[PDB]
Design a protein around this ligand. Structure first.
Ligand SMILES: *[P@](=O)(CCCC/C=C\C/C=C\C/C=C\C/C=C\CCCCC)OC
Ligand SMILES: *[P@](=O)(CCCC/C=C\C/C=C\C/C=C\C/C=C\CCCCC)OC
Lengths: 537, 537
């Protein structure tokens, strides 16, 4: 039954042929148009050229669609091509704030008459009845969703690889992961086949690909945007918050996507989302900033690249008049091991493991499926046998123990209290915004699966439900790749060894830096990113 | 051990003698002043006469403290006097939107150096370390919190009584409940002891005391207002939403309080609340509305008083030019029995039962504590044995069966989906607001304990997390109590049987209607509440 991944492979092959036979039907008819200086336009310049009618909507759709096709030959990022575009081009509203703009979709944003497989033979049957809510609003805003992009198998991976469609590669280097789980998004927007795209984030899936491929990405407060058609593979887990949001080549575009999204159509097609507009005044501010920072979280050791990134943008922010304050949120081990990991695995992983009945398990996933299937008595035995030796691992196995509804209630209270305590710590130092190292040079291929402890930096602000953003600031020089031989993490356990060998051999590869604000302050967060981008690039 | 209820009985008698000596030492120092025209001033005029300086802060505090001392001798609504006022009179901010206004808090709103015993022996030792966030912003807006008010025992009741402070009565008729679980708030605001107070509502606890005592009251969306230091007995419960909200004599006082609450101070003390301002221009609006209505939910039968009030207030809104459309939420028996009841009791009662260890359980809580203490096997047996005869009571026992975390996520998702379906129902009939029966004349004394079914009208909107609002529209004619002998339920189980005896003997007592909008649409809800007040009264 799952041998019908051959059934998905031909669907993908067909969609790619349909792309190719529409761009040779365009590039023949339009032989004189400049391809390269269309694609290297910043989005703000691109939408302004469209609205001012200097370019047709057809010219900018088809130049991107060719460039999507061209880089998918390298990366394997494109899942399917969303056929009822061109008729979406014909009836696109002019006064919409994204009128010309083609958008790439993560596969999980459901689109009418198309499969939202998560990589799973379970969901290879049935196409969606209707377009999901944020897709509905992007279309009413003049945008033209054009592709689905690849994910890892259950979306619970920061690699990108999948039994139904294959592995996605990093456009900078073939031996490298594009990030995940919006890894298709990340591979396609890097190397220039898309100006704008949408991802999801529950442990860092907007920020992993952004940081690995050297693009910009924001994870808003979980209830800023509407989830009202998001295909997930477990539902109803409400401790550690899911968010969707934008991915792009510049932070200015993330601001555009968000302002286009935060409109009266959205607050009407989904009234559970609070009607909070894009506060342009808070974004466009040039008042100086009280900026929290840390060099490390005392959990995942930074790479020399991460550290060099962090300290350099610390210095440049100080030189531009911002006061830079030492700040570390309390009880990071407790936040990761019991709140985050125990919030994700509250049920033992039974709901998640039901997606995997009769399926192949992808090598990128590691041993996570094997370990979740182990009896609960054996989980607990392994847990306390490891506790005298490798306590991170001990806690990992302890988080996978199935809880009661009583014990979830205690966990959901511990989480709201912890969020309150970081809010009191933040206000005590009078911050507006906080700077964080983002997880360093893209890890090798099937190695995100074996380095679960490296999501520490990102998974914190899902647990807190703070807006977090990634902006690329530097690239790995031949001494940042040399000091990786003198790496040994804080714990010296198995996760640090995999991380040591995964992060090596990555000269010229982009490194990023994480920018966080408080809940519902995502335009303050974008403002800080604009500052960080401007100073470093 | 719980025998130190008598530690609180003296604390109550001490605070009731401090109020008496202070109102005398003022009234002897101020003999010529008018009480009966100070008190009967509607809030809007009272704040505007406090703002202009026609009236003193001290002339409104010690008059209202006076009335609250007098009415308490006939209701037992007051629990403690909030001593560190008068310094709250001397240093109230002069341009605060409620600068003169004395406010009454429900017991659970925690206040520095005073207790929030929720009628429990467990909480009697320790006073609260800090003023809770909404108390804080009231004090930042010039309000004077002056009394803590009585609650039923664990708050899971719509009577009001407990083994620490004793029984609280309805001011209209001494044999009747004030409602609850803000029963001390309704009994105080009815009969003129307070211009304003805050309550909480997870199942009707702002609305019951509103409707029974003949006042106004609104349950906002769960995350419109901050819960930051609210005292509960179960923490970590997120399916079925707790909200706090204003209770007062007119809907303009609710909107005054809501606009005073919704300020940049509240969104700063607690950044988890979406910074959504009070939109005046939606509240002030006078454009005709499309109004959904139902006469019954087919679950709790209306009192002939209830049915009368609904159809009467239907006809008037039709005669003002509003268009009144038949509308009933899909699958109400499903949302009460499995989603709400299940959602409240998904741990089997364990967390809720820990507050009764060594406590007296109060006779107004009925047999709830006796039934939750029953072991799993007997509950399941009694469930499948009552299901041919008495389906409601079986489903009730089926909801107290202890779920796993897997079975809680499923329920959370079913809840988030059920919301979506009632929203889609609302928008395909293109509604603005909804008009709903409200649980009729006040029930007797120890009687809400054995009429659990009758919360169906109110608890549906905690399940849906939609704004709900109570506004009085009539009082019970001798004809409404006449047709009350002809009442038979839709089931004739023990809940309907108790409901006949408890709602009889009620001529002259108030009856109210319920007003529902979409999530986050509070000002529109209040706008519809204004009109239904403006027509009927
Ligand atoms: P994206 O938001 C996130 C991709 C998932 C991250 C990859 C692997 C982790 C999967 C399961 C582990 C669960 C919890 C561990 C989290 C924090 C604790 C850190 C380790 C301490 C034991 O996809 C939508
Ligand atoms: P207030 O918001 C609400 C007071 C509590 C209501 C009084 C008694 C009900 C207590 C427990 C029953 C739990 C769930 C039943 C709910 C709906 C189903 C209706 C009956 C069908 C079986 O206090 C803060």
């Amino acid at each position: 039954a799952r041998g019908a991944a051959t059934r998905a492979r031909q669907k993908q092959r067909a969609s790619l042929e349909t792309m190719d036979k529409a761009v040779q039907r365009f590039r023949l008819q339009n032989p004189d148009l400049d391809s390269e200086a269309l694609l290297t336009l910043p989005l703000l310049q691109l939408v302004q050229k469209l609205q001012s009618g200097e370019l047709s909507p057809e010219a900018v759709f088809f130049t991107y669609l060719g460039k999507a096709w061209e880089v998918n030959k390298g990366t394997n990022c494109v899942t399917s091509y969303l056929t009822d575009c061109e008729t979406q081009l014909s009836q696109a509203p002019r006064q919409g704030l994204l009128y010309g703009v083609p958008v790439s979709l993560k596969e999980c944003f459901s689109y009418k008459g198309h499969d939202s497989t998560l990589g799973l033979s379970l969901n290879e049957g049935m196409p969606s009845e209707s377009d999901c809510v944020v897709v509905q609003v992007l279309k009413l805003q003049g945008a033209v969703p054009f592709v689905h992009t690849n994910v890892p198998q259950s979306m619970l991976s920061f690699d990108c690889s999948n039994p139904l469609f294959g592995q996605t590669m990093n456009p900078w280097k073939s031996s490298k992961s594009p990030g995940g789980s919006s890894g298709g998004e990340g591979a396609l927007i890097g190397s220039g086949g898309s100006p704008l795209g949408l991802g999801t984030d529950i442990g860092g899936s907007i920020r992993f690909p952004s940081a690995f491929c050297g693009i910009c990405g924001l994870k808003p407060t979980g209830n800023r945007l509407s989830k009202s058609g998001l295909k997930g593979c477990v539902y109803g887990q409400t401790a550690v918050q899911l968010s969707l949001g934008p991915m792009a080549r510049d932070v200015e575009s993330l601001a555009l996507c968000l302002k286009a999204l935060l409109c009266e159509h959205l607050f009407t097609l989904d009234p559970t989302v609070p009607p909070l507009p894009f506060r342009e005044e808070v974004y466009r501010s040039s008042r100086p900033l009280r900026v929290g920072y840390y060099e490390t979280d005392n959990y995942t050791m930074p790479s020399p690249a991460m550290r060099r990134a962090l300290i350099e943008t610390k210095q440049r922010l100080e030189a531009a008049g911002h006061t830079l304050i030492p700040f570390l949120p309390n009880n990071i081990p407790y936040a990761l091991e019991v709140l985050s990991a125990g919030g994700l695995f509250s049920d033992g992983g039974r709901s998640f493991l039901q997606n995997f009945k009769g399926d192949f398990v992808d090598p990128c996933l590691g041993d996570l499926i094997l370990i979740l299937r182990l009896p609960s008595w054996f989980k607990r035995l392994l847990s306390l046998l490891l506790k005298p030796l490798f306590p991170r691992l001990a806690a990992f196995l302890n988080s996978m123990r199935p809880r009661s509804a009583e014990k979830l209630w205690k966990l959901q209270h511990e989480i709201e209290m912890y969020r309150q305590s970081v809010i009191a710590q933040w206000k005590a130092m009078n911050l507006d915004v906080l700077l964080t190292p983002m997880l360093g040079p893209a890890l090798d291929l099937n190695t995100p699966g074996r380095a679960t402890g490296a999501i520490s930096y990102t998974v914190l602000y899902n647990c807190l439900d703070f807006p977090a953003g990634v902006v690329p600031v530097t690239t790995v020089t031949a001494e940042d790749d040399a000091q990786m031989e003198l790496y040994k993490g804080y714990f010296g356990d198995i996760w640090d060894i995999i991380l040591k060998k995964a992060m090596k051999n990555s000269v010229g590869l982009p490194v990023a830096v994480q920018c966080v604000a408080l809940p519902w302050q995502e335009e303050l967060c974008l403002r800080f990113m604009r500052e960080v981008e401007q100073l470093m690039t």
